[PDB]
Amino acid sequence: PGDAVRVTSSKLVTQPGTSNPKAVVSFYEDFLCPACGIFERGFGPTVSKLVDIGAVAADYTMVAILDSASNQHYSSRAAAAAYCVADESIEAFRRFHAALFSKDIQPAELGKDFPDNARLIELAREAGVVGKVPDCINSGKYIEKVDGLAAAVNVHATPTVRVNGTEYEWSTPAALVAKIKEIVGDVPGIDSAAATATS
């Protein structure tokens, strides 16, 4: 998946003869982007159920298009923190990625304070990891990578969603599930994925 964090479960359905997922949903997101927050709060539970029943691989590329000195470089620090978390644990990344887009945490784009690195570290702890994450965050390990990411993957707007490489104009979670079903068919649980309330 390249510069993305790939989230899958043991049940992942793959193309015959290969270990390639039958269905890949690609997300390009900025942790400071308000629409991304609404999108993830609205689709996250469905995508998590799709992953867990094995219907999709969910690939997350966290760009930093909104990053600026005026937001205390939150967009880049948050994305880089997420890559640090994924190095330790994909399960923790799922929780951390969801947490940063929650209503309690996602900062006002034009506000006067933003989670500092200590706060990002504490959020990673809550998502279930310490390990190398504190050093990874404090050293700015993935800052250069996330700053170059929008250019490297040629995505300049967020959120950008694709299904098997095809850009997807999203509306409802159920509509996304219908599209996945067209690809994977009757994966057990797929009908229930549509009506997933929480993650």
Numbering used by the authors: 57 to 255
Recite the paper's sentences:
Here, the Mtb protein Rv2969c is investigated and it is shown that it is the DsbA-like partner protein of MtbVKOR. It is found that it has the characteristic redox features of a DsbA-like protein: a highly acidic catalytic cysteine, a highly oxidizing potential and a destabilizing active-site disulfide bond. Rv2969c also has peptide-oxidizing activity and recognizes peptide segments derived from the periplasmic loops of MtbVKOR. The crystal structure of Rv2969c reveals a canonical DsbA fold comprising a thioredoxin domain with an embedded helical domain.
To explore the atomic details of MtbDsbA, we determined its structure at 2.0 Å resolution. The two MtbDsbA molecules in the asymmetric unit are very similar (r.m.s. deviation of 0.26 Å for all Cα atoms). As in all thioredoxin-like proteins, the catalytic CXXC motif is located at the N-­terminus of helix H1 in MtbDsbA. However, the catalytic motif (Cys89-Pro90-Ala91-Cys92) in MtbDsbA differs from other structurally characterized DsbAs, which are generally Cys-Pro-His/Tyr/Ser-Cys. The active-site disulfides of DsbA proteins are susceptible to radiation damage in the crystal and the broken disulfide bond in MtbDsbA is therefore likely to be a result of the synchrotron radiation used to measure the diffraction data. Ordered active-site water molecules are present in the crystal structure at positions consistent with formation of stabilizing hydrogen bonds to the Cys89 thiolate and to Thr214, a residue preceding the cis-Pro loop. Helix H8 at the C-terminus of MtbDsbA and its interaction with active-site helix H1 are unique to MtbDsbA among structurally characterized DsbAs. Compared with other structurally characterized DsbAs, the presence of helix H8 in MtbDsbA buries a greater proportion of helix H1 (buried surface area of 592 versus 401–260 Å2). The H8 helix interaction may restrict the conformational flexibility of helices H1 and H7. Unexpectedly, a ligand, 1,4-dioxane from the crystallization solution, was bound in this shallow groove, forming contacts with Ile94, Gly98, Phe99 and Pro229.
